[PDB]
Homo-oligomer: A and B are copies of this chain.
Amino acid sequence: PIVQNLQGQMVHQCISPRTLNAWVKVVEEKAFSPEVIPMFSALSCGATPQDLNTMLNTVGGHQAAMQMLKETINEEAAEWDRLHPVHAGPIAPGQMREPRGSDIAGTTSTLQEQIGWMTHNPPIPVGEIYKRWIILGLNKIVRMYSPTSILDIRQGPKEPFRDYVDRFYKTLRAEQASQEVKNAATETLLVQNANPDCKTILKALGPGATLEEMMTACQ
Residues on A facing B (Cβ under 8 Å): 1, 3-9, 11, 14-22, 24, 30, 33-35, 38-39, 41-43, 45-46, 53-54, 57-64, 66-68, 70-71, 140, 144-145, 162, 165-166, 168-170, 172-173, 179, 182-183, 186, 210-212, 215-216
Contacts and interface: CB of A to CB of B under 8 A. Distances in A.
B21 A63 contact: no
Given A14-B45, A17-B43, A166-B63, A211 B68 contact: yes
Contact of A20 (B39, B46, B53, B211): B39
From DSSP, what is the main secondary structure of chain A's interface residues? helix
Max chain B Cβ within 10 angstroms of own Cβ: one of A14, A22, A34: A14
Given A42-B54, A140-B212, A17 B15 contact: no
Given A1-B14, A6-B7, A61 B166 contact: yes
Contacts of A34: 60
B42 A59 contact: no
A23 to B, nearest CB: 9
A18 B20 contact: no
B212 A70 contact: no
Nearest to A36: B60
Max chain B Cβ within 10 angstroms of own Cβ: one of A6, A64, A183: A64
Contacts of A18: 16-18
A136 to B, nearest CB: 12
Contacts of A11: 4
Contacts of A166: 61-64
B169 A66 contact: yes
A6 B4 contact: no
A159 B1 CA distance: 40
Given A6-B7, A17-B19, A58 B70 contact: no
Contacts of A210: 68, 71
